[model samples]
Target: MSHHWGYGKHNGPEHWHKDFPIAKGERQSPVDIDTHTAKYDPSLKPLSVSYDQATSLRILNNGHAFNVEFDDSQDKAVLKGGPLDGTYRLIQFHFHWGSLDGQGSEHTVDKKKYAAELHLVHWNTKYGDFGKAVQQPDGLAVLGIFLKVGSAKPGLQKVVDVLDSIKTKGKSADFTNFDPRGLLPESLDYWTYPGSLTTPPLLECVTWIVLKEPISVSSEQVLKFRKLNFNGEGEPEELMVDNWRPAQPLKNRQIKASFK
Candidate 1:
């Protein structure tokens, strides 16, 4: 059976290394991005994202975070460029948030935390499939976008509106024709680095492209996310708040910026 990992005091990130040794590996994810140490790379290309609204399938609460899965059978939606060699197909997207507005984001900037964070996961096409690709060093590309408290984001509101349907874990609803591009900020400038998945089975195969600019969402919208339960039906009720992994050691890794 797979080891159960969670964001609780006993089963949180600190205890993950015991189950998945790689949690303490060299290139872990969600690092505190020290802007001063990041080097600008003019050679880096602006990120190219082409998302088709039709490819969106459903939204589910996976006992961890709610995920909006995509139909990646074809290259209908993919992300390219921006320190990447080949194209990565969009697989799914999810968010990590906190109980309050001050501390939720995973990838902090200069130790500063945002209210939440969005992770758009994609798999490299060269590696055959998402499962096979994640084992390789250059297998996945995750776009991390921070979320701050401000005016209500219409794009995010669409997702929040359907939160009641999937209030418990293992619950999902048909969520289609939603263009994820609407969630992105005006700027595409980002910081790229080699890192691992922020969750369990923390494989060091992801090329993280974290956007410098954060998208806005109102405090009310953030409150809706907290209503989700981490536990499944019939289990003890546990609110799904603070579902973010803390920053890990950067080790010998260097963060490259797509802009000056």
Candidate 2:
């Protein structure tokens, strides 16, 4: 009956709040993309990834979860290129999936929950690496994507196809020549809100981008993810099937959406 996701105990936000007491104090993300002013201009569309620019896809085995370490800071800075110089560096990428039939998406909009969620974490290179800014309240931005369950989704096949190579712990395969841009949905319109890291110490300064559209992944792929583990010396040793937290309160944060 346990729907425990990655390395954390109690399998949800409640446990996170208890184990990492700061959960309630930390700035939470993925709130209902609230009402907002349309201040974005089309000329400000962020930069996408180029094969040469977003190179060195270093896959890291963090014991708890696996992350794809790719360079997007200098090469594919999401913003601060043409009009601005504050390019955000691509730090790492991770995902969240449910264990049972449903649950585990960090963001639940209008009660719509997707199966898996991916966060492409970044920070303003103007300051330093994403990690350095993680402590600051405004130093980080995490671009999110909701994965709807389906084998027919486009770019999803690219990631899932390679999962077999890193099926076990401390293992990763190199996609030496891969493009990060291909993974994004064509539409650039998105919802932006201020929140904190869903993980421990849960920093309070995070800019979250919940995509307007939800992509697809096969159900079997989700099951495969469940096989992943996040047990440290004192953490749970069980398989992390669904690493999602129950939706948190917005606390009056406005979700701004930029529609192109």
Candidate 3:
């Protein structure tokens, strides 16, 4: 059986190294991005994003975070440009949040945290499949977006509306026609870097493009993420708040910005 991991004192990011040895590696993710120190690259292309509502499959409470998965069997949804060498197929997307506002985001700017973070996961087509691609150094690309407290996101309400159905871990609902682009802020200016997955397997294969602009969601909407339980139905329930991994070391990596 897989080893259980949680955000508690004994089982949180601090203890992940016991099972996922790479947690202590040279390029782990959710790094604190000191934007003032970031080098701006003129060559970084504007991001190209395209999605087919039909590609959206379902949403699942994976016990770690809620994931909106897509059908990647075709090239219907893909990302190109903006520091990517080729097209990366969209597979799934998820979020990381805190127990309260101002504490949830995984990536920080100048050590300032946002209320939440969104990660859209994709894989390069050069490899046969996502599973095979993740094993390679240039296999995956994850787009990160920050969420702040403001007006409720109409695009997000479709997702938030389903929380009641999948409140418990392991529960999933048939979610479709949801446009992921609607969740993004206006600007595409981003910081690109090499990093690992924040969770186990913790593969050191992601090419991260974190957006500078943050989307707004109401404070009450932020708490909806906490409604999810780490434990499944009929088990002693544990709220799935503060599921974000703390910032990791940057080592020799240079954070390249698409904007100055």
Candidate 4:
């Protein structure tokens, strides 16, 4: 049964449990990270990210959010260490944001929300493929980076400039040779946790590594994201803003910090 799920009055996150009971599960994602309570883990290795600019295939608006797809046929782009057991192949990267700058990010840091959040989704190579990996507890690793309103980020401009070409749901453009690493911040200090996908299916198979430092994006760049429509080409236009799941309950879970 394909139940349509979205960030809307009728199909929003609050109503997700109706179709996906796992939404109420213990490990739901985007939980508020309380820095004071997060314990430091000395054993956790610093994350290693290796990407090939040519692996970027296309960018598309999938009704939910815009995602840049990658050519993961080989190990050209991979994420290692940092609470992971094996090499995870980079599959796609996407973002979630709000209508306003103060309330976009999914995960809150000590109750503070950023302008947006970037999710770099990767699947464990041990699972053969993404389809199979999502079924296991250690199947996926998502690197969450907060986007704050500040000076313009050059790497992000490459993406923002193409938003107009794919203004509606299901629209896409050939977006090649873009190195996602340019979007990362200088520091890699992070908080790690066991969680699920913030969106539907809400599978509890993700190892979340959320960066403590945020990257910058000007207010104008954020407006460009809000301009994209959630509706398809012929449907009534619905602006695609606030496409983020609010922080879920962090029950019986301990967040581990990569740095003290």
- lDDT per residue for candidate 4 within 126-145, as digits (tens), equals 99999999999999999999
Q: What's model 2's TM-score? A: 0.79
lDDT of 2 by residue, 1-260 (tens): 34433345545456666556667763685564433432344554553433336664756445555677776546553533322235567767878777764676778767767787888887876566666787777777678888777655555556666765665557777765555666677665676767888776577867777777776667876666776665433445657666666677777665656563
- Tens-place lDDT per residue, model 3, 1-260, is 33478787878899899989999999899799997789999988899888754278899998889999998998888888999898899999999999889799999999999999999999999997999999998899999999999999888988888988998888999998889877889899999999988888899999999999999998778778888898889999888999999899999799999887
User: Pairs clashing in candidate 4?
Assistant: none
Report, for all candidates in order, the number of backbone clashes: 0, 4, 1, 0
On the 0 to 100 scale, the lDDT of residue 113 in model 2 is: 75
Q: Would you give me the overall lDDT of model 3?
A: 0.90
- Residue 170, model 2, lDDT: 72
Per-residue lDDT of 25-86 in model 1, one digit per residue for the tens? 89999899998999999898999998854388899999899999999999888999999999
Off by over 4 Å in 3: 1-3, 52-54
RMSD of 2: 4.6
Ordered list by lDDT, greatest first: 1, 4, 3, 2
lDDT-superior candidate, 2 or 4: 4
TM-scores for the candidates? 0.97, 0.79, 0.97, 0.97
Q: Give the TM-score of candidate 4.
A: 0.97
